Structure 1
Amino acid sequence: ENTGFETTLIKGIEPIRQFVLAISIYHLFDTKLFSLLIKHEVASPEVACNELGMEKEKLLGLFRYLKNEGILLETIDGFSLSKEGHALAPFEGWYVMLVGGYATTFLQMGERLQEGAGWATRDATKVGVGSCGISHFDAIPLTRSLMAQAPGTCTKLLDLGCGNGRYLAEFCKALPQIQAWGAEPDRGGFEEAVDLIEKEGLSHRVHISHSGAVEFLDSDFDFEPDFIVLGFVLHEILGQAGRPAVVNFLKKIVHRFPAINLIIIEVDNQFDNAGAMRHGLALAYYNPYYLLHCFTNQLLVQDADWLDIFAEAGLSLVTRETTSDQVDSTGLEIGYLLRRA
């Protein structure tokens, strides 16, 4: 008879309902429909189609789906973002990083679980673009706070793994004397960085290279930085190349630039910490982030493990801070300001 089945089904597939909604919100941002709705206020499918080069019947389908979920309103004049839709605006970076960048990674987990199946791949351009959007709220303010605590003033900034160059665009706008260099290994991300720097009118002060971190430090670049920022880059090197390679990379930075100030941002691996994992943001963001990092060739370690790598590399801790508790109060995102020992 299946007595009471429907009520259990509606609850049982609530993760699928939200799965489709998350992908649909990601497309709303990524296709530039969200920005179109912000600019137009109300747009007919015909107007949105003409502007973005889209097909009306498919756009109507997406719009009707979002209207049923309350993200859009529909009037005789067309569609608009509802208050709930407008409220999604600050979270674009998270949708672009985790859906755009990592949907394929999560979908590959079943196959990648097999012995010898290798690491899950990702869309590194979207990971970089999304992570740079997120960084406006957490990592850039943390980097700024640590930079201000350093004894020397920043004049020549090097950002390795710069994504779309958001840290450099923000820092250079705020601090007009700075000359900067960024390196980004993903071609798509590198091209977005070159474009963002040009759009911000910073091309005369900021140069971007298409390069990985280790290979950039081995290259024959002429820059003499006094600050180097390593935002979530060391855990990539640690997984890909190993702990000796991370220690050697850090040793090379202070051998080449003995007076340099290093700012490292890392995620403390507390995936196995009961209390930490009950925090709302630990569940919403860090639990999927830790899962991705078991399937990709990156390795997250604990705060104590990073401090031990820094000591082995001959670095001294100046200060360590976490993000503002107004944005992320988990204590899992840690920033370190270091100097040569």
Structure 2
Amino acid sequence: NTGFETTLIKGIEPIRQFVLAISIYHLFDTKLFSLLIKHEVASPEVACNELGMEKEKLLGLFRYLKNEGILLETIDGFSLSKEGHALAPFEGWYVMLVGGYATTFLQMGERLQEGAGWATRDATKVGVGSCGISHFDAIPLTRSLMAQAPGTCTKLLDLGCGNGRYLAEFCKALPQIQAWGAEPDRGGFEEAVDLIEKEGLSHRVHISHSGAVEFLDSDFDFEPDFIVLGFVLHEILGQAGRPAVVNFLKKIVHRFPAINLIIIEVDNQFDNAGAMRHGLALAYYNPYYLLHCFTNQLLVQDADWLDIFAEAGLSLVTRETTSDQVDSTGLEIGYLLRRA
């Protein structure tokens, strides 16, 4: 086995990073990251008393993270290194892809078998995580499209709202807005009620435990002038089919003829060689397309969505992609539509 060790260190580099990604996810999810930001330096004993943890297990996680350069160790205790501090904006990606979809990727081997069904996910962490990401890409994109509409937003409806971050950010920036969010996952719904309460927006924002299609079939007198469907239609498309998506969009404009619809979707370019060599396409969109083949969701192309909108009796006001400072792939597309 001459020279085997050097080949082994490169050969298992994905395993080294696999354990690191899980450990970074727990550092955020358990509140240890925010505790280390607050305390600056914290001994295992102090962190255990504050979060109700066991010393020997916490010291093991801290020693592991110190060896990887995420933490520093002084006589007073452990602290986040400069590299560890720099992880702070990316929390949403770890919570969504590790917390939400680790079980989904681990189920791929068994779900490949004929008739084994769709892989499950932790929809609470998917909702919380994707909402954390939307602060950088989907919320600024929704704002740009809202500004180009022929009317001002007063009553906003967000279906598939996750933990309610889109509504929290839009309501703080636009104090006149009255909003209603709906989230089908119970864990995500409870996170949304808590985030709205924490931000002091319960008097202006209501949250319902409901799916997008059943919300439109339910009875209510609220008359929204804007509806946000952020990464919701591809779930309906996979679960119920294309005629169900067309009928869902027809029901929105039948019930609310003057509404403005803002739809955000990911253009499926999984088999586009050039698009998949972009650094962000390889880091995020390649595993995103993979998880969509194993779950009851279906991503389609930009032209396929425009065809669906035409069939549902909608007219396109404009369409845009995200800022090239956060995501320059051109794969995240936002559409502003009205009744034709």
Q: 1:317: Cα distance to partner?
A: 0.5
- RMSD, matched Cα: 0.3
Residue of structure 2 equivalent to 1:328: 327
Q: 1:239: Cα distance to partner?
A: 0.2
Q: 1:183: Cα distance to partner?
A: 0.3
Superposed CA deviations along residues 181-209 of structure 1, whole A, max 9, x for unmatched, are 00000000000100111111110110000
How many pairs are equivalent?
A: 340
Q: Distance in 2 between matches of 1:199 and 1:206?
A: 12
Secondary structure of residue in 1 paired with 2:2 = coil
Residues 92-111 of structure 1 aligned to structure 2 (within 5 Å): 92-111=91-110
Q: Distance in 1 between matches of 2:72 and 2:199?
A: 34
Q: Distance in 2 between matches of 1:223 and 1:97?
A: 32
Secondary structure of residue in 2 paired with 1:208 = strand
Q: Distance in 2 between matches of 1:203 and 1:89?
A: 28
Q: 1:229: Cα distance to partner?
A: 0.1
The unaligned stretches of length 5 or more in structure 2 are none
Q: 1:93: Cα distance to partner?
A: 0.1
Q: Distance in 2 between matches of 1:192 and 1:179?
A: 20
Superposed CA deviations along residues 137-175 of structure 1, whole A, max 9, x for unmatched, are 000000000000001000000000000000000000000
Q: Distance in 2 between matches of 1:115 and 1:221?
A: 43
Q: Distance in 2 between matches of 1:221 and 1:293?
A: 33
Q: Distance in 2 between matches of 1:32 and 1:290?
A: 30
Q: Distance in 2 between matches of 1:55 and 1:242?
A: 49
Superposed CA deviations along residues 97-119 of structure 1, whole A, max 9, x for unmatched, are 00000000000000000000000
Q: 1:47: Cα distance to partner?
A: 0.1
Secondary structure of residue in 2 paired with 1:249 = helix
Is 1:235 aligned to residue 272 of structure 2? no
Secondary structure of residue in 1 paired with 2:273 = coil
Residue of structure 1 equivalent to 2:55: 56
Secondary structure of residue in 1 paired with 2:208 = strand
Q: Distance in 2 between matches of 1:48 and 1:276?
A: 44
Q: Distance in 2 between matches of 1:111 and 1:148?
A: 47
Q: Distance in 1 between matches of 2:53 and 2:241?
A: 46
Secondary structure of residue in 2 paired with 1:339 = strand
Superposed CA deviations along residues 39-85 of structure 1, whole A, max 9, x for unmatched, are 00000000000000000000000000000000000001000000000
Secondary structure of residue in 1 paired with 2:289 = helix
Superposed CA deviations along residues 305-333 of structure 1, whole A, max 9, x for unmatched, are 00000000000100000000000000000
Secondary structure of residue in 2 paired with 1:329 = coil
Superposed CA deviations along residues 208-227 of structure 1, whole A, max 9, x for unmatched, are 00000000000002210000
Q: 1:260: Cα distance to partner?
A: 0.3
Q: Distance in 1 between matches of 2:174 and 2:74?
A: 46
Superposed CA deviations along residues 278-318 of structure 1, whole A, max 9, x for unmatched, are 00000000000000000000000000000000000000100
Q: 1:94: Cα distance to partner?
A: 0.1
Residue of structure 1 equivalent to 2:225: 226
Q: Distance in 2 between matches of 1:330 and 1:72?
A: 33
Q: 1:249: Cα distance to partner?
A: 0.1
Superposed CA deviations along residues 212-267 of structure 1, whole A, max 9, x for unmatched, are 00000000022100000000000000000000000000000000000000000000
Residue of structure 2 equivalent to 1:306: 305
Q: Distance in 2 between matches of 1:43 and 1:204?
A: 39
Residues 87-236 of structure 1 aligned to structure 2 (within 5 Å): 87-236=86-235
Q: Distance in 2 between matches of 1:241 and 1:74?
A: 53
Q: Distance in 2 between matches of 1:162 and 1:172?
A: 14
Secondary structure of residue in 1 paired with 2:298 = coil
Q: 1:334: Cα distance to partner?
A: 0.2
Q: Distance in 1 between matches of 2:233 and 2:215?
A: 14
Secondary structure of residue in 1 paired with 2:120 = coil
Q: Distance in 2 between matches of 1:278 and 1:308?
A: 28
Q: Distance in 2 between matches of 1:180 and 1:53?
A: 37
Q: Distance in 1 between matches of 2:220 and 2:214?
A: 11
Q: Distance in 2 between matches of 1:283 and 1:49?
A: 38
Residue of structure 2 equivalent to 1:25: 24
The unaligned stretches of length 5 or more in structure 1 are none
Secondary structure of residue in 2 paired with 1:220 = coil
